[PDB]
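P.,

For your records, the input lines for the assembly:
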Amino acid sequence: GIILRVAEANSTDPGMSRVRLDESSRRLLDAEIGDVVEIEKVRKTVGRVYRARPEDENKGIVRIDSVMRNNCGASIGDKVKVRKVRTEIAKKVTLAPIIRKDQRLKFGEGIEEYVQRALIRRPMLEQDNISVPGLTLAGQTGLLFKVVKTLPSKVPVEIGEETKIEIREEPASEVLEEVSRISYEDIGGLSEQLGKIREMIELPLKHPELFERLGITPPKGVILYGPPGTGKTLIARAVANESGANFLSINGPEIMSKYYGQSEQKLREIFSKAEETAPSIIFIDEIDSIAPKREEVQGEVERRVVAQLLTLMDGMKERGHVIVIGATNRIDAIDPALRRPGRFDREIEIGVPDRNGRKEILMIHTRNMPLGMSEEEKNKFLEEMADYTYGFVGADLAALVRESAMNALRRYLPEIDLDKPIPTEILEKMVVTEDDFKNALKSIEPSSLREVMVEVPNVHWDDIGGLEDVKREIKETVELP
Amino acid sequence: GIILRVAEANSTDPGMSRVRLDESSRRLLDAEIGDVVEIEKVRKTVGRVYRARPEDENKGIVRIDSVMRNNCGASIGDKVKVRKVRTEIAKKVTLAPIIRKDQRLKFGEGIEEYVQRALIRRPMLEQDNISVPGLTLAGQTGLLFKVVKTLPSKVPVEIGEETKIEIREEPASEVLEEVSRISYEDIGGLSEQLGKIREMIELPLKHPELFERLGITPPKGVILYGPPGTGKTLIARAVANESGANFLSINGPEIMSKYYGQSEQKLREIFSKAEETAPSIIFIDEIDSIAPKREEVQGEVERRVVAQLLTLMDGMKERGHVIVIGATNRIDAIDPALRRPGRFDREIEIGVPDRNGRKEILMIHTRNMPLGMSEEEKNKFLEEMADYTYGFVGADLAALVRESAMNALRRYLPEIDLDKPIPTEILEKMVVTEDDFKNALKSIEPSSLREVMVEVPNVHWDDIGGLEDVKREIKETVELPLLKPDVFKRLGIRPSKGFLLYGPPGVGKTLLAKAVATESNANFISIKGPEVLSKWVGESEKAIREIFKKAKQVAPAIVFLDEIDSIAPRRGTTSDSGVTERIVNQLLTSLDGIEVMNGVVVIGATNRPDIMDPALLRAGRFDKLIYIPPPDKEARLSILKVHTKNMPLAPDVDLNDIAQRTEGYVGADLENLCREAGMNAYRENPDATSVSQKNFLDALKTIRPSVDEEVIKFYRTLSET
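Structure tokens returned:
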């Protein structure tokens, strides 16, 4: 009714509070375009956004930015109350750093330059955390600032271009929901698969009694595939962020450091926390190390660690309200008995991206820096980078652009400013020309070891010549059924 | 006398107390149809059922529902006293939850909706547990309610549609025999095998002195095969339910958690309980983990755990009155010495289901939900789901429908009710459309890794065309030895394997041999080139020897073997020469040593034979060729009407003119011409070739006439020579 949905923003609008609202969705609320919005939901957490119309989306959902959902702690399908309010402008705003794992923060100037041009008329309120990326991939990422006081406090305000900004720099922590959480929009990859993997554990993990025995038996286990730690492993820790439950980490360095009698007791030790932290999710990326077994002799510790993990899941009635999942590099390095009942049943194969899927993966790593989608229509758009790149992955793309960031460095940083204090002039000098990403394509970094791949062509019938007799005949065969 | 048997209900009647009683069985008791029944047996446990007549069953047994046998604790072949009584109706009934492992139960409303429409006039008594499934597969299963008090208590009552139902919700336990027991009807799978596996341990486990040394030595051990934990392992715990004895569980997590000195003492520890809990049954599904041994070095613990298990069975005199059994995934991962005497002897191979066998497996997982058999005759019936599904198993089918239940969820649950309290309106909204089960068939979930499989065809002689000379000739070969044999001994003719076919691929030839399997009501075993190329890549070429031994139990069945010899000539020249290949000689030598007189019928086919052995022409092997002529005018017209009966009919298509001009088209061409030109026939599409007879003639000029007199002459020369 007023209840308009939250979702993962396709068009990101890297400037926060710019959240897309449909023209057909806003006329359902009878709120016109270009007004200050008040987002009010349960827990009495609030935030303000600016309406801008997308196209492909329909009135069934409203597609919202990640951080503004990370400010209200919104999960997909929540309940909010939004309406248009009065419009004002700020005067002088004071901000403060958010220090938890950050180890202090930026020292020097840029209190005006970096903040002002990135404001772009963001509706907001006092004590709100704004996310302002840009200026580079390495050293500058999505960064949250704690706003102390503005002169028009608690009232709806859009900070203008002629309004000064003061940075107190006094070290403090976040008032509202800082990072270490990764939203589904902060995630990127296969789209429909992201919703299909989550929907099975969606309803149980939220509430136990919402979906328990009703529809079917809940998930026993889930086996994941693909580049384990390209950001496929980041999805594991990411899924536990929206659910809010505990995340148990079964990792390489612990199973390698624990030999006979140390690991055997640790298997029940991590399982003892599974019953205590319950409800909790159990993610194992060590299936390659734990149970590589093809039925040979890897030693007693290898057969002991797998036999216990089988009994650890068997020792559970399947109700502590917990879900054990697993991940591995490829379709191989897995124990064949894991597909037997009484243990892991569902296996979800995670594939690779496509020309459109790569753009979703790139969009995650697209903005730490000063790039744009609508603001550069073609030259810096991701599809021009997608068509040349073949057989890559998020971490490879992340390390590729980071190596391509050094191309932006070697043309700027070393021969100009070697000083530890960061000048204010070097900030305007930071941009990214497509040549930096093209120079990495010519250099040897690209490698594709992937056996199975797919593609889609660019070829239309405008470049096709004669033989129209087969043309309509090809339509006869293929297109009719 | 009054003693009418209990059995496993084929027609389930998911509504309890609806138990099927034969019309011929009820007239033996002189009790008419549609009356209240009083079931009285030993221990003075009672229950009431409603009589409804089935058909195929006879008066020898009465086929009874599972839960009503689970209420009286009935085992197959018990003694009961049943008679017709007076008929009354309830007024107001009070029910209570059964809480043991259940962790409380349903909270909200539905005390009327869910109960009332599922009552369907069930005869019952006070303090009886009724089973009411439905509304979904996941979250709702067979559920028992404890009835506290009804106003007409202890008297025969059929709760009516206008009678209210009250749920006290006060937590309590079962008065009578709740779940955690799985009846043979609750079991599903191979039918005759379920009775054959149980009958050996049936008599001993019931009473020790009933059958002890009398007939034979009791079972030493039993080795089980198949998907260990698809519900094949559920059978293990299930068998111990009817017997009532103790069930010892040898499992994976305990043998993995117990290392050197922990497991070695545990082997005698679980064996010490075997003597204490005696009589008891010992089921081991860990034969894969315990004794995988092919005689290599798996470590000392692997040789120690198997050597003890050998002595654990040897340490027993064979009388504690106990039976040790075992199970494993496949015919492999087993110790070779286990077949030696002094230890496991009987091995019962558990296979996979069939179109009828799958319906029995589905019937177990069919009702947690609101489906029906007689109430939906076709659309929701299991056979429509069975014909599309191939190479599945109970747990795979259970997880498939559970994933297909999410299709029923995604169309209902998320976008409507996310609330923890369950509304009363969402209960009517729960149904299952066949599209949910079809969407999983299109999605990638189906996978078949199973090497050896069988099937049965749908093809009858109504879709078959001409060549009736071979028709009665196929009946001559195959169908005569079955009914005749006392006539077969009158003539005293020798035995033989079977005929052989030749002709262009799949003209009628794949359909003709496929039609004979349905008429004789026998099974169908197909060995085909693309089917064999799957075998010898996955190392199943040795299992072909087992497929030979597989045909004798499934008999009567026909064996259909085509183009295995196609890979013979590449290594050495074979047509009449007979130098074939190393794996193919396993086919040859077997046909020489395989016993005749069996229900197996050897059949083969090929385009032009041109690959064979001179032994394949000799007897005890492939036999007299059957010439497939090209369909004549009267044969083509009979074939064309089979192709055009599914397509629309109109004078625009004339079958007479094309039949007179073309005498040489085979079955594949006639089957092909309707494919692409039938899309051009009438209006399937805007193109201008529609509603013409020339569209068949236009494709007639493009396709080859397939008229070769030389290859037909080559057949007559190779046949006699």
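Two observations worth noting. DSSP finds 16 helices and 14 strands in chain A. Residues 394-410 of chain A form the longest helix (17 residues).

Regards
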